[PDB]
């Protein structure tokens, strides 16, 4: 999914019109 810490809110997956319901991992939180 997303990289190991640290990580803030990197857009590894492109948000569908702002929404996060179309990712491999739905919005990785800070670390």
Distances (CA, A) of 15 to 3, 12, 27, 29: 17, 9, 9, 15
DSSP for 13-31, written as a single string: S--BTTB-TTSSSS-----
Domain spans of the chain?
A: 1-31
Method: NMR
The alpha-carbon radius of gyration of the chain (Å, integer) is 9
Q: Is the dihedral of CA 31, 20, 22, 13 positive or negative?
A: negative
Q: How many CA atoms lie within 13 A of 2 on its CB side?
A: 19
């Amino acid at each position: 999914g997303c990289p190991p810490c640290p990580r803030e809110h990197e857009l590894v997956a492109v948000p569908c019109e702002g929404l996060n319901n179309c990712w491999f991992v739905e919005a990785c939180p800070p670390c």
